[PDB]
Structure 1
């Protein structure tokens, strides 16, 4: 209308977008900076980058953009695009975007008394340190640092307002704990003037149902299956096959898991410890299987069983496991022939008795190692899983 056109013509008269709009040049300009979190788009553990969708909030008073509503009866607010009025140069310090500024420039809404509002949206990429020590039961704190680039503390007085999470849309992987803020002043090597900044810290908890169902349970099941090599009889040549195939599958699982993790050397991750323990156990099982097979296929003429191993294996472990322990000239010529045949048969029987003793010793060793390996696997798995903090509360919140 006529009043709106006249007001727009009058307001921009003699207006300089380069000038800080303060009545007194010696006084700082107060700007209220806040934030409005809308969504956590992505958390990149490998690249250490957090992607969020937020709305920035800025507010200040303009001394020159004031008018009397009586003279312009219908006009209450005006809007100015980029490059026509003064705006703060507030940037995100720890940006990880190929172009530093990610905000989308929009209009600035103005009171009839000079109050200005500026709420630019955008997709913000920031570089925050991600700790994988307790993965997948980890809680991450990622910081967002904002502040004016070229305005010091004597010119632009930055103030903080609490972040808004009313329109937050929950994520299926991360659980938001809170987003507190802090305002502080710092000194830089450039200049002798303090530069205030506002830092917002996003605290998020990882939901562990997916990882527990897709990584931890299959590893437990395969490790338990690797213990079946101690129930197979040695007469079936299928023990090394079982052990080695299980080991190969677990190595594949290590590779799949490590393809998603950062190559940091700060600490050893919990899942890395778990995989190392499982693989060491499986390798020891393969070694024990080799020893048991060596005992089973023992040549009777190779050598007598040592007294110590014989007594311990055939008495103490047998008692402990309640093992069952098995166990005219023509006439003379024919006589010596049948005597030779009978003696040969008796020697064969003695050799088979020795072989049976060796096989029983192998079975006893195998059963003992089964018990020991099962106990060790259970203890190691439980201890490694329970070592992590907030594991119990993660289980309670996710599964129960």
Structure 2
């Protein structure tokens, strides 16, 4: 999975405090993260060797010490495919974020809170601008949860007791395949079936059927270079191809 995401950190640094009236009424400050302490919170389930954000932008500081940091990132996460119902598949792709520089007794990864009606509520979802989000042409987002995960088998001392994970349950838009893979093969196999109406006085029964099988072989070729060579399931389309190739051989 390739994603453009904005991480939004927030933490308090008591050392970045100041009385705004002692100075001029400076209510806020921008500081490069190469000068201040930064929690290197990294994508652990990354495929490329890219654990960090892409632009180490400035942190915003308030006189109370509240530091915010919204660095943008381009992550390449490892999310395995469930090809069973391909091309009608929905995937559950995860972005797992850890803190490998400090243990859970030194920092605590939490989810951001927000307010609506004087009540604090956590942001248990990926944030998506409903106007500025251009939907991908192949994948639709159904669910987008976010979870803080604790692993009690592990000890708090250690970097494996903590996890903030962001899940994308995305559904495929099955139109390119329906228009270029399924419909033609279905109709060509129907041709094979209809070969039984052809009289033997026409030397065209076997030609018809075996040419239909050649077309099915071409479609199998196109299909084989669309999925990973996994073995936890036979793709629905490959299932249908085997079924229909066997039926045409019959």
TM-score by length of 2: 0.87
- Mapped pair 1:186 → 2:137: no
Give the 3-state SS of the residue equivalent to 2:94 in structure 1.
Answer: strand
- Mapped pair 1:268 → 2:234: yes
**Alignment correspondent of 1:112:** 63
| Structure with bigger RCO (C-alpha 8 Å, 6+ apart) | 2
The CA distance in 2 between the partners of 1:100 and 1:174, in whole Å, is 25
Q: Which runs of 5+ in 2 are unaligned?
A: 113-122
Does the CA contact (< 8 Å) of 2:7 and 2:70 recur in 1?
yes
Give the 3 Å change call, closer, same or farther, for CA 249–283 of structure 1 in structure 2: same
Shift of residue 58 of structure 1? 0.3
More helix by share: 1
Give the 3-state SS of the residue equivalent to 2:189 in structure 1.
Answer: helix
**Alignment correspondent of 1:91:** 42
**Alignment correspondent of 2:139:** 174
Give the 3-state SS of the residue equivalent to 1:279 in structure 2.
Answer: helix
- Mapped pair 1:139 → 2:102: no
Q: Which runs of 5+ in 1 are unaligned?
A: 1-49, 285-400
- Mapped pair 1:75 → 2:26: yes
Does the CA contact (< 8 Å) of 1:93 and 1:147 recur in 2?
yes
Give the 3 Å change call, closer, same or farther, for CA 87–102 of structure 1 in structure 2: closer
**Alignment correspondent of 1:242:** 208
Does the CA contact (< 8 Å) of 1:78 and 1:110 recur in 2?
yes
Shift of residue 244 of structure 1? 1.6
Task: For 1:361-380, list aligned pairs within 5 A.
Answer: none
The CA distance in 1 between the partners of 2:108 and 2:219, in whole Å, is 54
- Mapped pair 1:165 → 2:128: yes
Give the 3 Å change call, closer, same or farther, for CA 196–189 of structure 1 in structure 2: closer
Aligned residues: 235
Give the 3 Å change call, closer, same or farther, for CA 269–138 of structure 1 in structure 2: same
Shift of residue 76 of structure 1? 2.4
Shift of residue 157 of structure 1? 1.6
- Mapped pair 1:57 → 2:8: yes
The CA distance in 1 between the partners of 2:15 and 2:157, in whole Å, is 31
Give the 3 Å change call, closer, same or farther, for CA 172–186 of structure 1 in structure 2: same
Shift of residue 102 of structure 1? 4.3
The CA distance in 2 between the partners of 1:99 and 1:183, in whole Å, is 22
The CA distance in 1 between the partners of 2:150 and 2:4, in whole Å, is 26
TM-score by length of 1: 0.55
Shift of residue 103 of structure 1? 2.9
Give the 3-state SS of the residue equivalent to 1:106 in structure 2.
Answer: coil
Task: For 1:205-354, list aligned pairs within 5 A.
Answer: 205-284=171-250
The CA distance in 1 between the partners of 2:140 and 2:80, in whole Å, is 18
Does the CA contact (< 8 Å) of 2:43 and 2:52 recur in 1?
yes
- Mapped pair 1:204 → 2:170: yes
Q: Deviations over 1:141-180 (max 9, x none)?
A: 1111112112111110211132311243312211111211
Does the CA contact (< 8 Å) of 1:90 and 1:148 recur in 2?
yes
- Mapped pair 1:149 → 2:112: no
Shift of residue 271 of structure 1? 1.1
Does the CA contact (< 8 Å) of 1:183 and 1:197 recur in 2?
yes
Does the CA contact (< 8 Å) of 2:105 and 2:156 recur in 1?
no
